[PDB]
Amino acid sequence: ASRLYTLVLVLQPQRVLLGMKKRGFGAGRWNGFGGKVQEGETIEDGARRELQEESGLTVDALHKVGQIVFEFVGEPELMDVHVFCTDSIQGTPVESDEMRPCWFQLDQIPFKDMWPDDSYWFPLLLQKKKFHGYFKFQGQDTILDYTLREVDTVLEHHHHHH
Ligand SMILES: [Zn+2]
Ligand SMILES: [Zn+2]
Ligand SMILES: [Zn+2]
């Protein structure tokens, strides 16, 4: 069994918009925008939906930048995380109950305040490289093992319900 998720990085020439989880799981960490793809929606519509809900932003285009798989100890569920980035946004960023957007200069990324896997694949995203990655987690804060690879084109999964 896997669970289908999206993550969207709003990435501009000198800056990246992250959001601070205000409540819930992972509260107090900065991350990209996204969440679970629900039944009855496509991955890309779920990505657009979560970004609109969490930041109030609309996007003209999303670029498929990567795939990450998360495995946890104790959970048979795997997470299939489809990563996107976008340069072209409209609206002004405003917080939801769940998330508060804030801009960071690209050399000021707060990796100590983000999830540990971000230290690995965020550099590739910031180099405009496409990637596949896998991270085996223990609890919240501990990567047990991982693999990461750059790729030329990204990985179509052909989800036929999404
Ligand atoms: Zn489904
Ligand atoms: Zn992009
Ligand atoms: Zn997938």
Ligand-binding annotation for 76, yes or no, is no
Q: Measured in angstroms, how far is the CA atom of residue 159 from the centroid of ligand 3?
A: 6
Based on its alpha-carbon atoms, the radius of gyration of the chain, rounded to whole angstroms, reads: 15
Q: Measured in angstroms, how far is the CA atom of residue 123 from the centroid of ligand 2?
A: 13
Query: What is the distance, to the nearest Å, from the Cα of residue 73 to the centroid of all Cα atoms in its chain?
Result: 21
Quick one: which ligand is closest to 1's CA? 1
Instruction: Read off the tokens for 93.
Output: 């960023």
How far is 5 from 69, CA to CA, in rounded Å?
A: 10
Ligand-binding annotation for 34, yes or no, is yes
Q: Which of 149, 141, 125, 135 is nearest to 16 (CA)?
A: 125
Q: Measured in angstroms, how far is the CA atom of residue 4 from the centroid of ligand 3?
A: 6
Q: Which of 127, 161, 159 is nearest to 148 (CA)?
A: 127
Quick one: which ligand is closest to 5's CA? 3
Ligand-binding annotation for 33, yes or no, is yes
Q: Measured in angstroms, how far is the CA atom of residue 73 from the centroid of ligand 2?
A: 32
Length of the chain: 162
Ligand-binding annotation for 71, yes or no, is no
Question: Residues whose CB is under 5 A from ligand 3 (ion)?
Answer: 80, 157
Ligand-binding annotation for 147, yes or no, is no
User: Where in the chain does DSSP place strands (E)?
Assistant: 2-12, 15-21, 30-31, 33-36, 58-59, 63-72, 78-86, 89-90, 99-105, 130-138, 142-151
Q: Which amino acid is at 42?
A: T
Q: How was this structure determined?
A: X-ray
Instruction: Specify the 3-state DSSP secondary structure of 47.
Output: helix
How far is 71 from 75, CA to CA, in rounded Å?
A: 8
Q: Which amino acid is at 162?
A: H
Ligand-binding annotation for 139, yes or no, is no
Domains of the chain, first to last: 1-162 (3.90.79.10)
Measure the CA dihedral 39/141/146/84, to 10°. Answer: 40
Q: Measured in angstroms, how far is the CA atom of residue 156 from the centroid of ligand 3?
A: 8
Resolution for this experimental structure (Å): 2.0
Ligand-binding annotation for 98, yes or no, is yes
Q: Which amino acid is at 155?
A: L
Please report how many Cα atoms fall inside a 13 Å half-sphere around the Cα of residue 5, on the Cβ side: 17
How far is 111 from 117, CA to CA, in rounded Å?
A: 9
